[model samples]
Target: SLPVLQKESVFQSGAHAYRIPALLYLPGQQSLLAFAEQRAAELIVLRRGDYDAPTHQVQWQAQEVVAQARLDGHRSMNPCPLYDAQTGTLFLFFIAIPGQRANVTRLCQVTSTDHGRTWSSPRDLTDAAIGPAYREWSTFAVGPGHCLQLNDRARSLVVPAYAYRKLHPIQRPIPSAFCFLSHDHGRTWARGHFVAQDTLECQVAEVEEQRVVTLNARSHLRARVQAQSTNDGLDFQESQLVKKLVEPPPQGCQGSVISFPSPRAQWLLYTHPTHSWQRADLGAYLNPRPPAPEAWSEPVLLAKGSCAYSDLQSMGTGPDGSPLFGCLYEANDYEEIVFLMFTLKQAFPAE
Candidate 1:
C-alpha cells in the first residue's frame, strides 16, 4: 500500500465566499481551476499552483469574478469548464436565466486562450448549440462540473446537461439528462438525443474505446441511472437504474464520475452520498473493468457528514509513478468546498 495521505481543504465557504464547486486540473495551465457560483448571479474562479514543488510552497491566487450575469440583467449559473487539447483553448459553459423567473434561459460560453488569465466576451450559443430539438423545453443547463473529451479521432467534446419540460407555468417540470457535442474542436456544437426521462444533473465517462457511459442523478427512483453511447455522443442506449447505488430517500442529488487508465486496465471512479435517506457519508466506488455495472467495487468512504455535489480529476501521476485522484467536494456541514487528494494505492490497497 502507498503511504497514508491526509486530506486538505483548498478553501472553505467563508474563506472566499464560493459555493457549488467545479474543479479541474489543467496540465497546460500548470494550475488547478476551482470555480463556483456566487451570489446566485455570477461565477467566480480561484486558481492554485499545481506544480511538482513541495506542498507548502504552492499558493492559491486571489479570487476573481470570471463570468458575470449582471451585465445582461440575467442570473448566471452552472460553471462547466473543459480544455480542448487540440487547440489549447479552455471553454466555460453556463446558463443565463432571465429576471426572477428562472424558468426561461439560454446557453452561453466564454473561451480563455491563455488559461484562466483572460477570457473572451460571452457568446450566446443557444440557437447553434442546442439547436431546434430543445426549442420548446422550458429550461436547461450544462454541467455544474467538468465536461468529457473523447479520445477518438475527432476528439469529440461532450458536455453533460439536462432540460426541464413543462406544459404550464404552474405545473411541475419534468427533467431529463442529455448532452452537447462539439466535433471541430469547439467550433460548432449541437445537443445529442436525450438519454431518458426522470434523470437530472449527470456526468459522463468514456468507458471502452468509443463507448461513453453516463451516470445520472435520478429524480425519485432513489437509485443512480446508467446509460451508454456506442456512437460517441450522438445517440444513447436506454438508461437503467443501478441498484447498487442508493440515492437519498424521497429525492436524489448530483454525483460525479471519472475514467482513468490503470496498470491492469481502464477503470471508472464515482462519488456520491452513501446513505439511503440523507446526504451524508459521501463515498467513492471503483470499477476496475469499464462498461460493466456489476463489476464495481464496494463503496469507499471519502468524506463523512453533510456531503453533496463533487467533481473528480486525474492529476497525472505522483513522483512514485502512482496515479493520483483528486476530489473537490462540499464538506463541513456544506459550509465549504474542500479538495482531497489520494493515490490509486490508497484506494485499492493490498487486501
Candidate 2:
C-alpha cells in the first residue's frame, strides 16, 4: 500500500501558472522551503513550511513573491535552493534570461541569513564566474531543483547546471552538464568543467559522507546520465548512462536526487516521472550504492497522470523511526504543485 504521511498543494496553477518546484528542508530549524517559477513574467515565489516529524504533520505558510530574485529586463527561471548548515545561510540561485534567439542566460543569486525569512538583493555572478567561457556557451542555468552543500569543513556549495555549447563551429549549441563551485560557502564561485555531452537539468548528491559525489542528469539518451566528482565538484570522471533510469519520451524532464543516511550506509534516492513516453506517473526509487547502477529498487509511484519537474529533500527521521522526505513536484499537468511527505519505510516497504 502507498504510505504517504502528508500531501498538500503548495501551488495550484491558475491564472499565473507555476512550474519547476524546488524544495529544501532545514533539519536544524525543522523548516521547509518550497520554490517555483511563476511563468509569463517568470519570477520566483516561495512557500515556507514547518514540519514536526514526531507528529507527522506540516504547515505551509502563504506564498510570497521573491521580489529581489529578478533582473530588470529578464525573466527568472530555475529556483535552486542551497543551505549551508555550518553558517545557517540560505541561497536561492536562478538564471535571468533576456528575450533570446541565441539565449545567453545569466546566473544570479540572493542570500538569506535567517532561514529564508528575509532575502538580500539579487547578485549577478555571470561576469565574475562565467566570464572566461561566456561566449563559448550560448546559454546556461542552475539546477531547477535543490543544489548541494557538501559535508566538508568548508561545506563547499555545488550548483549543478548545464550549458549549450556547439560541438562543431557551424552547428547549433548542444547541452552539457557542469557545476559552479564555491569553497568559501556561497560567497564567491567558480565554474567546473563539463561532465558530459548531451546532458541537461541536473542535481548532485554526496555519497560516502564527506568525499564521494555523484551527479544525476536528464538526457534524451532514453535514460538518466550520471557522473562523479571526488575533489568537491572541481572536476568529474567520464559520464555513465544509467540504463535502469529511463527518461520519458519526446524530451526528458528534470528530476531530483539526494543522499540519505541508512542503518548500513548512505543511500541514494531519486524522484522522476516513470512513464516511457509521457511525463506522467512520478516515481521514487532507492539506490543503496549509486554510480554503480545496481540495486535500484522498484519505483514507488508518488503522483499519477501528467507529472513533471520535481525536487526532493530528506527531512531526517520521522516518528516511526524511518527516514522522512519532503518532495515538491508538479502534478495534474502542472495544475497543482504538490508537496508530499513520506517515510523510507513507506516508500521502500520491501527494503
Candidate 3:
C-alpha cells in the first residue's frame, strides 16, 4: 500500500503578494524553503517548519524577505537555489536587472551556510558564471524553479540558464537554454554549451547516475523540448520536441522536473499545466525508466483550474520509507502558490 496523496496551501496570492515560485527542501536543516517574487524588486520566502511531517501537519514560518533588489533602479528575479550536501552549503542564484528587463540582466549569487536562516552578502558572478556569452546576448535568466547538483564522481553543480540573442535588427531575438557547471563544490562556476534555440526556463536532472543528464525546457512551439548530456551536463546535444509534453499555446509556461533512485531503477517526475492552450489543469507525470520519452506515463491532473509555473523536489521518503516528492506550484487562476506531497506508489498506482 502507498501513502495517501497530500495537497495543501504553501502561500497564496495575497499571502505572498505575487507569484513566480521556487521551492527547495534542505535535508541538512530538515526545513522547506519556499521562495517567490513578491513583485518587481522584491523577493519573499516562507520557511516551513518541517517537510517530512504528515501532509496536513506541515507548518510554515512567517514569510520574510530572502532576496530583494537594493541597488538603484534594479529588480531581482528568479530565486533558484541548490543544496550542496557534501559541504552543507546552499547557493541561491538569481538575476538582477535594471528597469525590469532581461536584456540588462546580470547574474548574482548568495550563500546560506545555516540552512537559509541567514545569508551572506551577495556576490556578483556575471562575468564568471555567465562567461563571455553575455557579450552577444540581449537578455538572460536562471531557473525560475530550482537548480541541481549531479550525483556523480565530481558532483558538479548544474544551474539551468537561458539567454536571448538579438543577433540582427531584422530578426527576432532567439533564446538558448543551457547549464552552468561547478566542479569544486560551488567555489567556482563555468558555462556549459547551449542546449537548443527557442528554449527557456529549463530544469535539469541526472537520469542515469553519471551517464545521462536531461534538460527539459519551455517552448513557444506549444510543446516541451528536451536534450541530453552524456558528458555529465557540461555539453548538450541539439534539442528535439517532445510530442507528449504539451504546452500552453501562443506561449509556454515554466515546468518542473526531478529524479530519484528507486529500488529497481531511476525515476523521473514532472509537473506542468496540461491544457493545450491555457494555464489550467496542472498535471504530474512519472517516468519509471527515463532517457526514454515513451516511458513517461500520462499525466495525473493535480489541479483543475488556473495553474502555471511549478518547482519540484525529491523529499527522501515518507515515514514508512516510501519514496516522496514535493511540488510548489502556481494555481487558482494564479492567485495562489500551493505545495503538495506524494509518494511513488500514488504516482503509479498500477505499477
What's the lDDT for residue 76 in model 3?
A: 79
- Candidate 3, lDDT over the whole model: 0.79
Per-candidate Cα lDDT values, in order, are 0.74, 0.87, 0.79
lDDT for 133 in candidate 2 is 77
Where model 3 places Cα greater than 4 Å from the true spot, the runs are 1-5, 52-56, 67-72, 100-102, 319-321
Question: TM-score ranking from best to worst?
Answer: 2, 3, 1
TM-score of every candidate relative to the true structure: 0.90, 0.96, 0.93
**Alpha-carbon shift of residue 172 in model 3 (angstroms):** 1.3
For model 3, the run of ten residues with the poorest summed lDDT = 66-75
Clashing pairs in 1: none
lDDT tens digits, residues 1-351, model 3? 123456777676663456888888887566778887776346546455575465434567877787432334667778898888888998888888775423467787888888887888777778888766676788888898889887787778989988887767788788888888889877788988887778999999887625788899998896899888998777887468888899898679999999888657678889999989799988888888786877778888777788999999887776546677778888887677887777776766665
The Cα RMSD of model 1 versus the native structure comes to: 2.8
Compose the digit string of candidate 2's lDDT tens values, residues 1-351.
Answer: 366889888898677988889999987888999999998637999999889766788998999999989998889989999988888889999999875435468899999998898899999999888876788787888998999988787888999999988667878788988999999877788999888889999999998844888999998789899898888888888578887888998878889999999757689999999998899999998898665776677788887788898999989987778888899889997888999999888888767
Sliding window of 10 residues with minimal summed lDDT for model 1: 49-58
CA error at residue 185 for candidate 1, angstroms: 1.6
Ten contiguous residues minimizing lDDT sum, candidate 2: 97-106
In candidate 1, stretches whose alpha carbon ends up further than 4 angstroms from where it belongs are 1-6, 15-17, 53-58, 68-71, 101-103, 167-171
**Between candidates 1 and 3, the TM-score winner:** 3
Residue pairs with clashing backbones, model 3 = none
